[PDB]
């Protein structure tokens, strides 16, 4: 269980664009099994991984007596492959079924075309579902918009909670920016953060990136960071 400490509900700032997703996740984490499965989806850097692992962490702290599994569709891929090569499907099925109560799968757009894996995932799904094991899937695209995907799988995705994340507004971004800071224990002029929060509006991966970037600079350059400085430093985040 190598979940990321930062990815918790506590470090997740809520807002109009990610509230429902947030609650679905929290609700499911409080009642693993009551809503199987949860399918969160949204563009890049919008909270998918973070939300998904929070469910993980939250359950680890309240249900320590549970086998929580976080994985990547890709790893699910690479894991099967070896299973086929090394010739050990059992080792695999025991690992992704037998020994898991809750299974969290990130970025499932990696299985597009991979109908081989798609099929295996399909049953893994069904077996966990027939035993009340919570399933959570994250995708950068909605069930219906997943190209080259077995309808039977896609049908497994919609048969439960299906939340959507959308980019946050300036106000919410700023609060996220502030929360990102704490996590990194950094600090910034209540005018630089504002500038960053307002112009690094793609995804939250980059927003934090900038916030890290400066901090790394405020590191070397023993002195602070004035507005003008940050603007040159953050040139690949405003018009990348
Ligand atoms: N609602 C939020 N509140 C605070 N931080 C957030 C929020 N959403 C995303 N983040 C930050 O962005 C990062 C996660 O981006 P991520 O969820 O992995 O993008 P994606 O979902 O496309 O994989 C985390 O490190 C987290 O600090
Ligand atoms: Mg992700």
From Swiss-Prot:
GO cellular component, one term: plasma membrane
Annotated positions binding Mg(2+): 49
GO MF entries: ATP binding; ATP hydrolysis activity; DNA replication origin binding; lipid binding
Coarse class of the protein's main subcellular location: cytoplasm
Binding annotation for ADP: 13, 18, 45-50, 205
GO biological process, one term: DNA replication initiation
Subcellular location: Cytoplasm
Keywords: ATP-binding, Cytoplasm, DNA replication, DNA-binding, Lipid-binding, Nucleotide-binding
Effect of residue 84 to A: Severe inhibition of oriC unwinding, ATP- and DNA-binding are wild-type
Segments of this protein annotated with the region Domain III, AAA+ region: 2-218
Residues involved in ATP binding: 45, 47-49
Domain remark in the UniProt entry: Domain I is involved in oligomerization and binding regulators, domain II is flexibile and of varying length in different bacteria, domain III forms the AAA+ region, while domain IV binds dsDNA.
Family: Belongs to the DnaA family.
Protein name: Chromosomal replication initiator protein DnaA
Species per Swiss-Prot/TrEMBL record: Thermotoga maritima (strain ATCC 43589 / DSM 3109 / JCM 10099 / NBRC 100826 / MSB8)
Boundaries of the shown chain within the full protein: 96 to 335 of 440
């Amino acid at each position: 269980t190598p979940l990321n400490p930062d990815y918790t509900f506590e470090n997740f700032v809520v807002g109009p664009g990610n509230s429902f997703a947030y609650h679905a996740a929290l609700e499911v984490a409080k009642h693993p099994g009551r809503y199987n499965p949860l399918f969160i989806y949204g563009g890049v850097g919008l909270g998918k991984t973070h939300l998904l692992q929070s469910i993980g962490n939250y359950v680890v702290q309240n249900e320590p007596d549970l086998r929580v599994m976080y994985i990547t569709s890709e790893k699910f891929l690479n894991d099967l492959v070896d299973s086929m090569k090394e010739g050990k499907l059992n080792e695999f099925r025991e690992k992704y079924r037998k020994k898991v109560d809750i299974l969290l799968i990130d970025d499932v757009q990696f299985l597009i075309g991979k109908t081989g894996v798609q099929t295996e995932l399909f049953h893994t799904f069904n077996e966990l579902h027939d035993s009340g094991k919570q399933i959570v899937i994250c995708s950068d695209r909605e069930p219906q918009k997943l190209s080259e995907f077995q309808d039977r799988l896609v049908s497994r995705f919609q048969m439960g909670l299906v939340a959507k994340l959308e980019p946050p507004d300036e106000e919410t971004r700023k609060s996220i920016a502030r929360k990102m800071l704490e996590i990194e224990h950094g600090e910034l002029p209540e005018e630089v953060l504002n500038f960053v929060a307002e112009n690094v509006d793609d995804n939250l991966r980059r927003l934090r990136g900038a916030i890290i970037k400066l901090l790394v600079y405020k590191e070397t350059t023993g002195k602070e960071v004035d507005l003008k400085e940050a603007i040159l430093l953050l040139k690949d985040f405003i018009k990348p």
